[PDB]
Structures are given as structure tokens and as C-alpha cells.
Amino acid sequence: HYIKHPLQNRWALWFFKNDKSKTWQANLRLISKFDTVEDFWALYNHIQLSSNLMPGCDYSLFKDGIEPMWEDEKNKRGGRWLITLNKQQRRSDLDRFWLETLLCLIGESFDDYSDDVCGAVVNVRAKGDKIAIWTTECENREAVTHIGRVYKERLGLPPKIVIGYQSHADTATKSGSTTKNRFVV
Ligand SMILES: C[n+]1cn([C@@H]2O[C@H](COP(=O)(O)OP(=O)(O)OP(=O)(O)O)[C@@H](O)[C@H]2O)c2nc(N)[nH]c(=O)c21
Numbered sequence: 001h002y003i004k005h006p007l008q009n010r011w012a013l014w015f016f017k018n019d020k021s022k023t024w025q026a027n028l029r030l031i032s033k034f035d036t037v038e039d040f041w042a043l044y045n046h047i048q049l050s051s052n053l054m055p056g057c058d059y060s061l062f063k064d065g066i067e068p069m070w071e072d073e074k075n076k077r078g079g080r081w082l083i084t085l086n087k088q089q090r091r092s093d094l095d096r097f098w099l100e101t102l103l104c105l106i107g108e109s110f111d112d113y114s115d116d117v118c119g120a121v122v123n124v125r126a127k128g129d130k131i132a133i134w135t136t137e138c139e140n141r142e143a144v145t146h147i148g149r150v151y152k153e154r155l156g157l158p159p160k161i162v163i164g165y166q167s168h169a170d171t172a173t174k175s176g177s178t179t180k181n182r183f184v185v
């Protein structure tokens with residue numbers, strides 16, 4: 001006898017293929033959804049086993065009903081904690097960071113503040129990979145800084161590695177690199 005183990009939330013995995021030729025929204029595809037521990041690992045292990053990372057090919061895991069874009073009702077007033085990797089952290093750090101990020105989400109690692117979490121995004125870029133946790137209200141200093149503190153600790157980043165929280169509204173009018181931060185941790 002084998003019972004499945006429900007997650008607190010249902011999650012959706014999205015794929016994105018970079019192409020500045022086409023409008024941004026056109027490059028997004030919903031892969032599948034899951035709401036159990038078993039189904040999470042089945043999907044995670046399948047991607048690790050049968051797929052290869054590719055520059056310009058992003059994955060996003062968001063709560064059911066939240067599209068992984070600024071436009072979404074649940075993201076428009078929100079923002080993200082951004083982790084920027086060096087080019088050499090691609091190997092033997094990116095995979096660890098991403099899985100640890102996924103587990104923060106589905107395990108609701110931020111306690112009552114996990115409610116403010118929308119999802120997470122990994123960008124694979126030759127310029128340097130990026131991982132981010134998106135939250136729903138960029139002005140909720142309490143929730144945002146708590147999520148940031150726990151997230152940084154969970155990833156084991158050295159204290160002198162300062163990570164920043166960007167409002168999506170600011171990002172939309174500049175760039176994730178030149179976008180100034182609302183908070184640091
Ligand atoms: C997350 N996101 C990104 N874009 C567009 O895609 C561009 C690249 O966004 P990016 O997140 O892929 O970062 P990248 O490393 O490619 O480059 P940089 O951040 O500019 O340094 C952005 O400049 C936006 O124009 C977006 N456009 C819309 N409409 N909605 C979104 O959520 C969104």
C-alpha cells in the first residue's frame with residue numbers, strides 16, 4: 001500500500017525560450033502541474049535525466065493560477081529576490097541552488113510568509129545564470145525581508161554576498177542588472 005503525500009499548494013512548471021524577435025509573452029509554455037511530493041520528484045528527476053540546460057531556456061515554478069510574468073494580478077505589485085551566479089557557478093552550484101529554491105517553495109519554508117510567495121524563476125544565460133523568488137507585494141517590508149533572510153541562509157551564500165530585492169515595476173522600466181533595489185539582505 002502506497003499513499004501519495006499532498007503539498008500545501010498546487011504548482012505549475014513553465015518553460016520559456018528566449019527570442020527578442022517575438023513578443024515576450026509568446027515565448028512562455030505551461031509544462032505541467034503537480035500537488036504531491038511524489039509528482040514533484042517525478043517531474044524534477046525526469047528533467048534532470050532526459051533534458052539538457054540551454055542558454056535562453058528558463059524554467060519557472062509558480063503557484064497554480066499565477067502566470068510567471070509581471071502582468072499577473074499577483075505579480076504586478078510585487079518583486080523578486082535575485083541571485084546572480086558567476087559563469088563558473090553554472091557547474092556544481094546552479095543545480096544545487098535551483099533544487100534548494102524549489103524545495104523552499106513546495107515545502108513552504110517561509111512559514112506564514114510563504115503566502116506572499118508567487119514562484120521562482122531560473123534564467124540560463126551565457127552572461128551568468130540567475131535564480132529568483134518572486135513575491136506578491138514589494139512594499140511588505142516584513143514579509144519580503146523575512147523571505148530574503150531565510151532564502152539566503154537556505155542557499156548557504158557567504159554573508160558578504162549581498163542579494164537584492166527588485167520591484168517588478170522598477171524592472172519593467174529598466175533592466176534586472178541596472179534596476180536598483182528596494183531591499184538588500
Ligand atoms: C520577466 N520578464 C522579462 N521581460 C522582458 O524580457 C527582458 C529580459 O528579461 P530577463 O528576465 O530574461 O533578463 P535578461 O538576463 O535576459 O536581461 P536583463 O534583465 O535585461 O539584463 C526584459 O528586459 C523584459 O523586457 C518581461 N516582459 C513582460 N511583458 N513580462 C515579464 O514578466 C518579463
Ligand SMILES: O=C(O)/C(Cc1ccccc1[N+](=O)[O-])=N/Nc1nc(-c2ccc(Cl)c(Cl)c2)cs1
Binds near residue numbers: 016027028031047
Ligand atoms: O524552439 C524550441 O527550442 C522549443 C519550443 C518552444 C518552446 C517555447 C517557446 C517557443 C518554442 N519554439 O520556438 O518553438 N523547445 N521546447 C523545449 N521543451 C523542453 C522541455 C519541456 C518540458 C520538459 Cl518536461 C522537458 Cl524535459 C523539456 C526543453 S526545450
